[PDB]
Design a binder for these strands. Sequence first.
RNA 1: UCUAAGCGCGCACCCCGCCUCGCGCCCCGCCCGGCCGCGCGCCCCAGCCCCGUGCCCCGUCGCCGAGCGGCCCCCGCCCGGG
RNA 2: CUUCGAUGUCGGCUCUUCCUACCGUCCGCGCGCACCGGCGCGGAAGCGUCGGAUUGUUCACCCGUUCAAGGGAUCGUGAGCU
RNA 3: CGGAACGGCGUCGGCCGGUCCCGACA
Lengths: 128, 45, 181, 270, 97, 186, 169
Amino acid sequence: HRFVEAGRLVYLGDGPDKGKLAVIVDILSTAAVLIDGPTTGVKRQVVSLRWAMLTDQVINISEKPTTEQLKKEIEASPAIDTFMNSVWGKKIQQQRLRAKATFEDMGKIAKLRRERKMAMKRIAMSIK
Amino acid sequence: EPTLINLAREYNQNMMICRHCYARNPLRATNCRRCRGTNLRKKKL
Amino acid sequence: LCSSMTIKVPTDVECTINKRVVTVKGKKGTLVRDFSHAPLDITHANDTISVAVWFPRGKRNALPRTICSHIENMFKGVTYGFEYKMRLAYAHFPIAATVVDNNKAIEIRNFMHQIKTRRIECLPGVTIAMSTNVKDELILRGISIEDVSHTAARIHESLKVPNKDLRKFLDGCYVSSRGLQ
Amino acid sequence: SHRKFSCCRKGNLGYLPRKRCTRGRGRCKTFPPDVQGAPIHLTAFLGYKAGCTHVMRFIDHRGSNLHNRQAIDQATIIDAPPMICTAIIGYAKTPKGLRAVTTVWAAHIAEPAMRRFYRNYFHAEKTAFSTYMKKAADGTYIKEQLGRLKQHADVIRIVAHTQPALTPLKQKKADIMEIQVNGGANVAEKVDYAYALMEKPISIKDVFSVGAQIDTISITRGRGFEGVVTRWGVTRLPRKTRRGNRKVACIGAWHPANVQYTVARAGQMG
Amino acid sequence: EEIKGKTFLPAIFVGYQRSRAKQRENVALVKVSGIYTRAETDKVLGRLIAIIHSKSGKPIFGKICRPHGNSGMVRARFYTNLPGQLMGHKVRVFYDN
Amino acid sequence: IDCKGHILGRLSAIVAKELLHGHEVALVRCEKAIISGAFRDVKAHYLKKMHKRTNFNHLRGPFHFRAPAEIVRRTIRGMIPYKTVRGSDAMSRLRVYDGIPPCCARYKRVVCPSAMAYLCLRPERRRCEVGRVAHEIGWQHAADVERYEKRRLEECDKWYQDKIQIDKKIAEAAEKDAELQRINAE
Amino acid sequence: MQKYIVYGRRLPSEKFPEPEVFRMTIYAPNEIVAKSRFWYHLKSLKKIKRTHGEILDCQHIEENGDFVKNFGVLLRYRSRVGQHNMYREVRETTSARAMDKVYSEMAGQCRARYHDIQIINVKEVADEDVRREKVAMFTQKGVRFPHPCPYVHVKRAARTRFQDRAPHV
RNA sequence: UCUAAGCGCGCACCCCGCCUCGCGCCCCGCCCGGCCGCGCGCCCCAGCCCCGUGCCCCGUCGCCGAGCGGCCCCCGCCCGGG
RNA sequence: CUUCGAUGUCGGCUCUUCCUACCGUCCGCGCGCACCGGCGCGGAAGCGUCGGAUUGUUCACCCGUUCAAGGGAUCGUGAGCU
RNA sequence: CGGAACGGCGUCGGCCGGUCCCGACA
């Protein structure tokens, strides 16, 4: 299950476009692949398959589809939405939000995280 | 006896010996299993 | 690149493959072989088991076919069985082979007038019987080729002349026929 | 250069260190294998060497010249007065080895056992087991603790004490020794057999049989500081050696630069 | 103590800025938690940190000055100099000031 | 840290650094750690490493501990400055056990993925468990450690069945001030 | 790495007022190495040293990288035994990127550095003309293979190190 | 086709036992007393059964008890003979 | 090259250790291996490799026997000896 | 894993020739 084929939505594990969604277009080798992300921010690039973890959704794609043809299909296909509403999708959105947190914000959250640890002790003691 | 002597010769006499390894090796062998890639075989009656 | 091979499942045998453990069920029994020692995508695919190794390099390419053959030996062994026939070969001294237990072990005595007694215990799933019509011959019958083959190698290994010229002293128990019936 | 003439090392190096034994008396160290479902039996007994006699025996050994012939052979008498069993130790085999669960003692321990527990019985305060005799003697304590052994132990042993009053020895204190109970169908069969013997004499006639073989275990006769020739068996040097002939002439070579553990040295023999 | 409701982000004083030849006890290397990248270190740069002296019980304050390697370790300077028996002991980058 | 599947050297180096940050690590199930390479060769290395001993007195010499946790501990004493106080104290902070003993059964255990042999080591690099090499060099508790880890697992599962049941009650208490923190914690 | 078309000729002389202008297409990291490689060839090929010559242009070509093509390169390389000729095919978006792949493969398998390798020609083989099975395997219309290295998401473990469970792949 | 996966047998060698020493620890007896900590599913990675999280606050407000896991405490000589 | 305001200088005796480039014993395999024997080869340093005549001799040589490899350790071994 | 002449049907990569839908006697 989950294969490197044209259209597979790929999460970008590393690189300039980490944390972004793209579609495989052509496979140069097992090592590489040409991905582009018109709906997202990824421009057309050749990335190593290492930097791109496969996601279950595969988008319908015309062979060698440029950026404009690929965008029409990527916009029409409901695959990006299905992945973004998924458990992996929701985590990616949550991870995106976490990165933009100032030192002042990191403190806010740490107080609200200690408050939770204590709340669970108060609740677990209650569950007798 | 005859056939049983042939069956025993199959398991005891029909082989190929590598001259360096001295290893028993099949009769259609090209290279010795132990003396890796050593191509020199024989077997005597 | 996928190096694939395919085997066709006989309908005499109902086979289940989970993980890399393959269980075949046949008239003569159920055999279970685990192939998790190697990287293979074995698939049921209607009536065809396909081993399917992926990205094969030097010996990964070798794996698809041994597994497919190890599975068809399981299918054949459950459907027909395996009988390896072993003929005791001697000259001056007759070998005495006695089948013991519920036909689950053998004792070979009088090898070259030796006071030693050599009992070889058949592996679980192989039964040793004497020839009903062949003379000086042992029939090893079981559903597993590896079990029936290993049991017969031990019987051959037990009867080994100590020193001497094995070419002149060609006595021993030797596998004569290996076959499904 | 080489020694030039092959000769073995004088001495066994598995009997090293050759030091005076720190253990008080001979200890068993290991016990006979447990063996499952055998007849239940006691593995060891403590005795005191008495003497040696020499016996005439009829030897039925076929293949020996002395078959259906007569032999005078040395034999050693060991005095073995009955031993009172006083306790029952259970050990559970664990990842760290056998670790004792508990040792349950009898409600009454005889004076020779108590004597072992104090250096001078007369000037001793005699407090040993004082609270324990009160906690025991109700019956319930022993059973509840024996129940702990049945549930959490694998190796049940009986702790026995020799009676020195029945011996010509000047000891007056009982040698206390653990003896394994082997052959039980279940652990509970061993503890139950042990309870029958608790606070009661056990005799050699029950423990061993004529014709059976026994491993004697004891501390040897002592000769004190002894020289290399007597202690290790080294050859006395020729009579003209200045500094004496009773020594190992070279204790090593220039390299390794320290004297080796395998080189014979003077010290305690016995 | 001056620090009571000061929340803090856990950190550890790993050791002095050293080479396998020469040690510089003036600057101390601190591993701030949740910071694994030299670029991540910017968020905690120029911030007050403290190490509680183990004999005294009182805080030796200091500031985080600059990043040490690509893996987050920061270089920090303290009002005095850390005694060297305080390596591995925790440092506290306060969320407040 | 459960050393099940952890490559000996690659886990030890992650642990040695945490011992030097004053972290008080305890390593359980060391017997299940993995040494890369054919067993016959791994055993041969551990049997060659046991041949080095001070000729004059072997009791003055290197000590070869045959137990899996004692091998694992010597691996860390190599990647630690032990003669110095910083490293001698760090060596004190380490507790290593084969199996999960009763002392460590009730602690929460983590696993370092970077040092595990499924992610590291290609399929085919011939893995070897530490315990097997230990019984070949001379550990005497291989069977006793398994027999206890079989009974430990049996209680673990009985406890888990009760734990799944209790957690439902804990999770069912999702109404309180905890929701207020969750909404803010974004 | 970059791709340059370098034009150069011998200096004008009284016996030869106009000298011949020679153009070569050199794949090199920088303009200075491209000019250096050009002169190495024009010394051996046409007996023109840099001292006796002028480089009239070292143009940089920015080839379009939108779609993958198959490239076919022929090179001459020098081993510790002696010079050898070799044809390597590579599927890459551009020729400059194709020489990076070839140089990387020649460094790793043939232990050959850039200065040993001389590039006789690079060309775009069509899917029909590809002669290497590594290249041909992916020329096919629909090529689907599992992720070759999905365990390589261990990039999480450095940042994480300890984790409650061992992650599935 | 003994080997590449898989498997059997296998050396006066090696490792273990038995044996010699044994730091520590254990159980018990006398004594039964303080001090400390707060936290448990398992497997498998060519099913990986839904993943790519979590914890991220050991004082930062946490510290009762309960239960478990610890740790410490504890134990004569002279003299006479062997 | 290092030691000459000094590192005692051959063989024997005595004593330990070490190596393998293995003579016998062990395990396989090969012979122009019928057997007995020999002989070649790979693994193998656990044990054994002795008593004497001449010589200061190591070596040599011869006699004998359970038939007898080779070496290293400041050419091991002088506040050990001769 | 200082290292040689020489071996390798270990595995990858090349160069150059020969046959194969005139199926590599049926």
